[PDB]
Design a protein around this nucleic acid. Sequence first.
RNA 1: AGUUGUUAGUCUGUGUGGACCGACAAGGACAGUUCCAAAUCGGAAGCUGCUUAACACAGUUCUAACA
Length: 854
Amino acid sequence: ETLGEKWKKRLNQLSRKEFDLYKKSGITEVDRTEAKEGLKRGEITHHAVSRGSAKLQWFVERNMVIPEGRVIDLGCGRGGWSYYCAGLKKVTEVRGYTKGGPGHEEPVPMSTYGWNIVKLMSGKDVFYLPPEKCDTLLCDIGESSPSPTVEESRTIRVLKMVEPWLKNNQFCIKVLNPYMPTVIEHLERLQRKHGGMLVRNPLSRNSTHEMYWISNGTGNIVSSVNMVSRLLLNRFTMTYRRPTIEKDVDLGAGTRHVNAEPETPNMDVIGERIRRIKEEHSSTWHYDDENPYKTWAYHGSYEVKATMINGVVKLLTKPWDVVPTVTQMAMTTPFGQQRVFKEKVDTRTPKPMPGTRKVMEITAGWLWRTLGRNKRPRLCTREEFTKKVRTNAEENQWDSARAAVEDEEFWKLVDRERELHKQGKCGSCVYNMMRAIWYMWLGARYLEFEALGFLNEDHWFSRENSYSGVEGEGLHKLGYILRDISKIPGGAMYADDTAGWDTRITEDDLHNEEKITQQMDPEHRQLANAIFKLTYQNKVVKVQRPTPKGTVMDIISRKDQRGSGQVGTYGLNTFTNMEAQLIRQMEGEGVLSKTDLENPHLLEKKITQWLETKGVERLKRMAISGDDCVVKPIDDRFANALLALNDMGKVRKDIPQWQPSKGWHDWQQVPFCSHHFHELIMKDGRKLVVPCRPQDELIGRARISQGAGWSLKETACLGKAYAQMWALMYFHRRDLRLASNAICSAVPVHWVPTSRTTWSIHAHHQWMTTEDMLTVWNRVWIEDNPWMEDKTPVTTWEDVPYLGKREDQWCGSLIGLTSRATWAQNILTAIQQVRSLIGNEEFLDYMPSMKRFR
RNA sequence: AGUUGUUAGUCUGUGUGGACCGACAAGGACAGUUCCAAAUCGGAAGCUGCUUAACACAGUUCUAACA
Ligand SMILES: *OP(=O)(O)OP(=O)(O)OC[C@H]1O[C@@H](n2cnc3c(=O)[nH]c(N)nc32)[C@H](O)[C@@H]1O
Ligand SMILES: [Mg+2]
Ligand SMILES: [Zn+2]
Ligand SMILES: [Zn+2]
């Protein structure tokens, strides 16, 4: 009696809930709720048809099977495997076959990336098929039954049918029941004939002993079968473990043209960088050929080594241990990194139409002329960069940066590279996507700062100067900016997000952002042109990648797709967004039609006049920051001006490509910088405007102390910083104010907060002091607030207003539940516990600041 | 394998429709006197001293078990 059948019988002797829980013990699962909803609604993009997509992705990622050439899918069913395989590099045609009909699944015609090369046929049983020549053969046929002999016979039938297909080609066949002696003998004969191994997918439910026979990979069948069987047996009596969760597979959209995907790099521009990278790592450099990069270039790879809850906060915010999102925030590996790269960065946006490029050029020229009506560009200096680094104004490894700045050979390296830039070549300007390496990277950043740092150090995109940007405001002013927008006559307030803004920057966008050089001086212009044309339009990137033989860093390159970690990313993103929404408003007002977009030479007098007359006005109906936009057009035709927006390649997120945009009317609901804004009324009758966000996110981000040092002296100070931020910006949430008072009461008063709380450009970090928080609140919201005419100070933490209970609950509070009530009443005990744990330092009771404990 | 459904009760929304209103407050929540609401009284309507409906349609209301 083999082990497998023993497992089968033991399983067959289970009960209802015992079965329901044992089938999900220690397996990984895919959150299909979003996909289920989307498919139910009727979307045609960005969605896996079933869970077959992730199941095959697990194989494809680890190079167990490498789909290539023509892919034949047998038993495609809904089409998960076929649609996933349509979006790989070497694949060129996918044919899926299935029985279909009553009691069977049918293909779901969709338009994910690569749909134009996929043909799915129904009403064809594969068993009576005249097998053809296939370069990849995927088979996912099988029907599980309690009877083991029936499954055995079914398995033999499947293997017999599938054998005449395998003619030295990549394959992945599903074997439902591999623990039977004749099944095993047949598998061994097949392996001897064709090679390949037998492996278990970890996404497969626990109820089944299914495995997959795959081409790339060798091993012993019986040993692996026994290994899986023993795993099932030990999971039988193993304590229930909740199933690990994995994010669903994204699949892009649009037709795929394989003949236009590969990129031809300007080797004479990046050759020096590539050569230096090769020389530094010459022991392991090797042109791997299994590279999955479709739209980027590939140049090589080298081996490399592959590379916590805050105690105090978690000890004081217990009731949220059960909220799902709070934990889910806490949960960068090369597998996840590669998935992110494959489904987000590795696309190719179609070229704009002939008229659209002309429109974009005209708009960019006018916009750069208008932005520079007062200020003039200037070179930054070494001392400015030094000061900015020293003040520590997206990581924590700043001390090494400061040491590099204060060193001297570093500046010699920078000078050498700068002379190279003046010549017209770039040697060591290459950036990652995760100490000589440190100095080269920091020097590249410094040169970019020197050339394009005036876009921040002179506030080129402040609200006063740019008419749209919100640089230099901070959170406590975006609300008033939105309110002042809403008073302007017009339609709704559309905040249409864009999917992966960085990765949708056409070449023309860079060519237009380059126009700022037309206003500098030649000594500056040489350096700026060097930056633009040698490290923005020809970028060389390193990226990790896992392979059966460890982790290798790939070196790739591309010409579009502004890298997210460059100086001047914010400024140029804001500029592109401003001109994009300007064009969208242009179309919305009828000046720009389809015919105008299509003709190669649209007359520019019309656009010139429209801009010169109304551009400044239409620029005041917006609030822009990076990819975040809010726009209030004159009439609601704006919601249907999607030709210009989609043609430029800026496709909106989570909405079909042509469904008109949905705009709000209550400005207190329009999202902006991941916040919305509430208008409070104090007892004095003078109104405040405050930020707000689903407080699960706030608590989560408070419980994810990230490299702040394990030192209790440091985690406590980080918690204090978070609490003071809560008291200063989110004082109007009952849970947040209560928890903030608790934390600030359970940390010694003399300790100084460190380890900055947020990375957003919209935080001036007023909470990072040691002062009477009431005074800082007064300074932030009363004295230094341009929108508060009556400067009468607030004297105690009781005149400070609160959100209405309805809105407070609606934004994710926990008032009205029993656990929160008990926590609120017992908060003194938890404070005492933290005080005892800390030591014997001074503690001020901030709880009496509420009328609860007074 | 992928897919994954019924049954009964309960919370929304709407309509039909006489189909509700006010005062009040036990108690709870909240910590900004800020909100819930039993029980009671008063009125309103219906069928004669008693009642505050019932049904319909839809849910990612919740519950509870069955394929
Ligand atoms: O993961 P999946 O293959 O979808 O599980 P299935 O529900 O399809 O069942 C497969 C396999 O599991 C056994 N089984 C199903 N339902 C069961 C039950 O209620 N109680 C027991 N003890 N076993 C059960 C069945 O053998 C079937 O072949
Ligand atoms: Mg099943
Ligand atoms: Zn360089
Ligand atoms: Zn809110």
